[PDB]
Amino acid sequence: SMMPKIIDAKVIITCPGRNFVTLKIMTDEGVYGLGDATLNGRELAVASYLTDHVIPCLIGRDAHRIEDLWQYLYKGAYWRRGPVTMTAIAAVDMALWDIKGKIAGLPVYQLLGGASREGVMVYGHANGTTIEDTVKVALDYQAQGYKAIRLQCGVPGMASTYGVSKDKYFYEPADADLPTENIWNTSKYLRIVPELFKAARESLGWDVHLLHDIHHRLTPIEAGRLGQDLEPYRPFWLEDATPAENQEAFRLIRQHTTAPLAVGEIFNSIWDAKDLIQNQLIDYIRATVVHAGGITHLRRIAALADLYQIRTGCHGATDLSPVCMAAALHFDLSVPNFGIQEYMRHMPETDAVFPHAYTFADGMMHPGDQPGLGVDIDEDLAAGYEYKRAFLPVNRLEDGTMFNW
Amino acid sequence: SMMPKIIDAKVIITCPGRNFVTLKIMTDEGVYGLGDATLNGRELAVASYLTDHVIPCLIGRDAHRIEDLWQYLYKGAYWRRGPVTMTAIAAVDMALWDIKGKIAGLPVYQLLGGASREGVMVYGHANGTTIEDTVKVALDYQAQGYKAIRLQCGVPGMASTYGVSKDKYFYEPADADLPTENIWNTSKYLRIVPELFKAARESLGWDVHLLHDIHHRLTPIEAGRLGQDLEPYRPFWLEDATPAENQEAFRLIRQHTTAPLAVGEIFNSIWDAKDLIQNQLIDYIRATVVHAGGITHLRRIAALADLYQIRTGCHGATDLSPVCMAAALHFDLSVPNFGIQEYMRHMPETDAVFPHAYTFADGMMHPGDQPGLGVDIDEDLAAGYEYKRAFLPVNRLEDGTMFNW
Amino acid sequence: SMMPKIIDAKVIITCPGRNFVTLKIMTDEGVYGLGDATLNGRELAVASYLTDHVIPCLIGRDAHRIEDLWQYLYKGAYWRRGPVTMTAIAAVDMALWDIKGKIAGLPVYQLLGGASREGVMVYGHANGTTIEDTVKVALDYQAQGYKAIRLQCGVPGMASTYGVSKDKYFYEPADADLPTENIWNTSKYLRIVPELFKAARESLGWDVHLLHDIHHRLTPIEAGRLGQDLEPYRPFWLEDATPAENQEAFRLIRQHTTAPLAVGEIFNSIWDAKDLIQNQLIDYIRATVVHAGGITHLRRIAALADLYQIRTGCHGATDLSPVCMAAALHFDLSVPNFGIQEYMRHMPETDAVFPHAYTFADGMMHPGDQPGLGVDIDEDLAAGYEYKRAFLPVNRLEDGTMFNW
Amino acid sequence: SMMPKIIDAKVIITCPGRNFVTLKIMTDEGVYGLGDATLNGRELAVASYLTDHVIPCLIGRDAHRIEDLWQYLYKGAYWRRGPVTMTAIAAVDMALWDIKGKIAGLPVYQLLGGASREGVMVYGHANGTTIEDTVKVALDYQAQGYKAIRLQCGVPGMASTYGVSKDKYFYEPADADLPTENIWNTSKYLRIVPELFKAARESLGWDVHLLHDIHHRLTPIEAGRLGQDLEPYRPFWLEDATPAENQEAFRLIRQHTTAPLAVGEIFNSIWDAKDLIQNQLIDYIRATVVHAGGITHLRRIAALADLYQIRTGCHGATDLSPVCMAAALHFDLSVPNFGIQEYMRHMPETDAVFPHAYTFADGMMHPGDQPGLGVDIDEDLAAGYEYKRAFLPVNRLEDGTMFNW
Numbered sequence A, B, C, D: 001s002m003m004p005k006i007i008d009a010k011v012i013i014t015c016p017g018r019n020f021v022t023l024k025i026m027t028d029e030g031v032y033g034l035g036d037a038t039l040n041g042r043e044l045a046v047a048s049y050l051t052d053h054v055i056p057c058l059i060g061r062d063a064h065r066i067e068d069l070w071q072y073l074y075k076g077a078y079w080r081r082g083p084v085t086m087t088a089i090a091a092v093d094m095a096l097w098d099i100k101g102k103i104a105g106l107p108v109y110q111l112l113g114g115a116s117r118e119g120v121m122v123y124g125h126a127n128g129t130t131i132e133d134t135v136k137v138a139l140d141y142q143a144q145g146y147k148a149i150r151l152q153c154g155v156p157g158m159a160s161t162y163g164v165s166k167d168k169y170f171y172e173p174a175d176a177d178l179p180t181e182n183i184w185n186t187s188k189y190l191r192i193v194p195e196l197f198k199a200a201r202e203s204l205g206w207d208v209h210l211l212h213d214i215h216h217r218l219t220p221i222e223a224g225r226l227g228q229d230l231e232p233y234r235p236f237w238l239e240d241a242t243p244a245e246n247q248e249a250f251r252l253i254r255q256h257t258t259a260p261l262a263v264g265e266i267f268n269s270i271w272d273a274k275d276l277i278q279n280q281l282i283d284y285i286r287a288t289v290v291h292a293g294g295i296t297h298l299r300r301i302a303a304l305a306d307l308y309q310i311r312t313g314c315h316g317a318t319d320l321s322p323v324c325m326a327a328a329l330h331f332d333l334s335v336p337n338f339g340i341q342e343y344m345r346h347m348p349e350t351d352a353v354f355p356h357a358y359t360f361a362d363g364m365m366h367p368g369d370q371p372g373l374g375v376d377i378d379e380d381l382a383a384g385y386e387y388k389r390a391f392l393p394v395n396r397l398e399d400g401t402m403f404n405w
């Protein structure tokens, strides 16, 4: 019945504890949709991609035509793929699915096949300077009812490492108006992680799922070894073992370890993962609605993965807004090959700016049953938190060589 | 708002010109859905699969949970895949999507991404005893506005061959209460088809799309040769070149010809086509909503094909009911990598039994905009046409060897 | 001399402790043959496939022409392969071999190359709630003279798991008029099986063959790990490690463990196993006469397997009738690459309905030396046990996701 | 009922127009079986293999146990495979199948699945010094009702070539008490064959099947070219294009031509053909009952070939005795993937020594319906034709280099 045309769209930028960029699409029927467009450390490039280029092309279009607009933006940009490009496309896609649900009077998961499960298992983030500190935090997460917990500890002798900070229920690495410089030592790291997992199993037991993020810092043969060393402790996954622009990079890892492997939070399209999937080089795909081209495209990534029993493990750090989390949870509740959802808690100010229907209890989340995504933005409140430039950190080897953070 | 539970389901069997089996699923809200379950020549095996086994398990279920029921039936059968199994699953799936659209107040294509195109290109079926007869019929189809036409002619010296009969706008091969026996000669066939295409281009010109169905009758190296011989005439596709249970069977064909290849009307799951697709051995995938596990599963087949620029070419013979055609047209209007839709006209009695919203004009079809699939069944009218046993034909070589029909 | 034509055939359905479907083919010479057509949980779909479609085509045919009828039904169905299709074909094939033996005055094994061995080694089924319970039952089987024993134990903390029940010499999972729902936890399972095998070797010693059925519940990399963990205990096989519709699914398993692998009880044709065999991904093929197209086709599966030193390990649960067991034992005694035969004991009522010549003693079976298969059906007795609907169970993960049973 | 033990066996050697070696196996029930053991040009090596080694091991064995004796001889020889070894094994195997049929009171084809066809298509042999001579002979074969004809012509400027002689309905190359020396020129040959096929199609037309035997004389890239040059004339096959000990040798041929390829008359086991078959490098497999390990083993070769739509094309030159031809025709009538049977006529003296039931009419043969193979040997008549040493020819290049005949 309702046949809404897009009449206006705008980018809202706000910093309630950290930067978020949001797309709002309005139709002539008064129904609107929201999409996350946040790209941590490069936020204003996406805002411009949208405001200056994409939005003008949205005006007048049939909001029902989700696939058509996806293809129009993907093919029509001419220069294909990429983090800025695909995040802009995701934002439009999310917003259109939001609108579709509102028109249908159904939550988005009902449009994607309905619920495949009763709730969405998440993991939280235990970090500490020492192994003892890390295990103590993990015990707290376990008591709170988390079924899965990521472990990150300090590397002895090294001032910093990925995932360790003063924050407990999250990790906010974009912490400075210029990139914070870190120093990395692979040898020390390879020896500490197995000791961490040993101590963790001793205190937590064997039912809880234990995860670890390598954060791009190993070569393939080094990752193969870390895998071998962690097998005794049965990790749920080892994530981002080695840079993956070359999709053959995981071959040596898979040849040498049975530790389950996860990758892809920085992937922006199926083309970044096609060979990793088809060659059975990974067990979990980490791509997200916001960074890999929205619900439309993420469903295709998941479908390819399903053929090889690879499961979804969407990235869920703080730099994905509650709009992204809402979309992710609708995707998670409905996708058949769901694995796990990452859950870092947002600041209270963030929750206030983005009121939402999704809930967390007893280690499980649910997207809620409001029409569409079940999320909104309080524009008046958002206007009170001005953008503040903040970069992700960089990492160098001890001789000064640029390395992977 | 509406949360319908399945309260009853039943199989309706009717023969308005030919046999059709239809599943009707009723919910406690009064909304119902329809699914085609027709499996030509083996119809009552699916009716029993549904009535005796599947239907009892449907009662009480949440009709919104399409994916859950698909997986429940697919995995839960224990014995996986197969023509009877997957047709029963398709029928349930179609019916649930029908219900979903009705609940949403939207035509099904609006749930599958919206319209990717303004209409759906179809092909019709020109057949004749001689090449001259065949080309004359093709000229009529072309004048009627068909943009694409399948050509089948008699093989000189042979009493019968696939696709040639007294019927003009369709072909009804299940014509006897025991399988009609045919005699096949490959040598004569390989020499006639290139002469047919030569004559066709001479009269029809080069804009019209010309198709040919080999109907499983060649070895791979023979199909490679027929391809080479047809390249000059630029066929839109050569279909079912060789039996494909062995998915390596298309390798020699693809090595030796650039004629576009189509296969898969008899496929019932993605597992029948995964290697043909990933190895780039075909250009069009012919699997249908009714025989390959419904909309849910056919979308996954299409998504895999899309990665390799392979397009959909759904089978559309008379033994797929208007319920299947409605679903196919919703799929066709929304799938991004649509290629073509086969369209054989149904008998008037069939149209009367299955009133529908889909339309045909100027070589193009459209699913219409009624909620759900836009199809119904007139049960009182259906009851007046009793089931009549009818088998597909068989084919033997001249020495009597069982062969492929 | 005798040249029998088929004059009639019929499907007999009976439930002497569980459902069985049997095909009886009568010839004009008075000689008849029997074939099992039982497809657990979907029985009436095969009965209809036979009664309504296949049987009409059998009438008048030369019963000597076994290959011709196999090809006629396989190719002639048009829609190829599948559990209902291939079980119907198997039933006809078994019945025709039965007839052939009767005409020749020889047991069927004498037509298949003669005896390759003096008897057929079988395995029995030890199950228990605890490891201690399971090992105690295994000790009893070992004392009874079984040379091979399958071990299944409960998963601590989980109400149910595959293969564990109150029944000792068999396992009857189709136990309800709707599918029983189960809840699955992979983590707990992966830790219990190695403890079971450790305890088993401690009590049983190292000569006995010990088997385990994973029953489709692991991903490939998980199965690789379970394999690594079980190698110390030298399992005879680990069965159905991961769903195998994708035949590449066993690649990661084979890469990482030397535990012998078995698969295929649910396969219905050689096309389900060709790549698993040719790529040397398994050690035993489990396909059966009744579900994979009869003696004619199972011999071809075994011949392909033989080239790679892969051996037969026919499935032998209670849902394969004594008619199937008779055929299996004739196949087993004659096939060169025989590995083992599964043997679950039938209820006394079942044995009464299907009198047979095959015997069991000291862990070994033999098909007997009666003409044909050496099995009959007491139709009067069968008529007293009416069909009773019963489904195989389903399995879900703890979040409710449909999973593999 | 009858359970015959082998009591004696003997080798009969006779030369009714050419050398034949025959194995006769006698049982204590008085039933006997015959097997061909003729290995052209090396006949007495097989006679000794049998008389001195195999026969002593046969005495006392259960004649019903065909598979057991096959494996016993194949594995038990220790030194596996080979022309002398496998011909001895074939002779035993043929003789045991002969016995099995006699015991069953059935012709052998009835034990191998029954008849798959009404008769067996054969090809005859047209040869001439000039192309004109060759085509004239072919016209005669065509008039006589042959559906398929091999063409061999002289190479202009060359005194001899394979397949050309004064004999019309056969070719007897083992013609001297020392190997006849021939001189070969590849260049001249590559230019003459396409002219032969051109002339043949001009006179014979396009329905008849036309075959050509390259007889091992080309390199792969040369065979690829000859294939390309013959495609216009649609040869039924091009046989033995290049020596095939290296099974990769056919790769370049298959890459470059769609002419159908045949190989394998000199193969003695499936191991000589496994890769040619699995890599889809040939269309017809030419191995015979007598040289590739009998009926038992040839059925396995055919079954592997069937998976790839490769058909049988048994070699049938005069040096295979009527005992072999009888076995071949029982195999041919029953094998599902039959392609064609070679038929060279034997001398009248040969037919007198080996009375048989098989017949030829109108280009088709049939094994007949006598129990067993339907062949016998007249020992008194055989005794009147003494062995006469005769070698196959050799071939050298013009510089004297040893080459392939």
Ligand SMILES: [Cl-]
Residues within 6 Å of the ligand: A081, A082, A083, A084, A085
């Ligand atoms: Cl970019």
Ligand SMILES: [Cl-]
Residues within 6 Å of the ligand: B081, B082, B083, B084, B085, C081, C082, C083, C084, C085
């Ligand atoms: Cl089926």
Ligand SMILES: [Mg+2]
Residues within 6 Å of the ligand: A213, A215, A239, A240, A265
């Ligand atoms: Mg990460």
Ligand SMILES: [Mg+2]
Residues within 6 Å of the ligand: B213, B215, B239, B240, B265
């Ligand atoms: Mg077709």
Ligand SMILES: [Mg+2]
Residues within 6 Å of the ligand: C213, C215, C239, C240, C265
């Ligand atoms: Mg099992």
Ligand SMILES: [Mg+2]
Residues within 6 Å of the ligand: D213, D215, D239, D240, D265
């Ligand atoms: Mg030759």
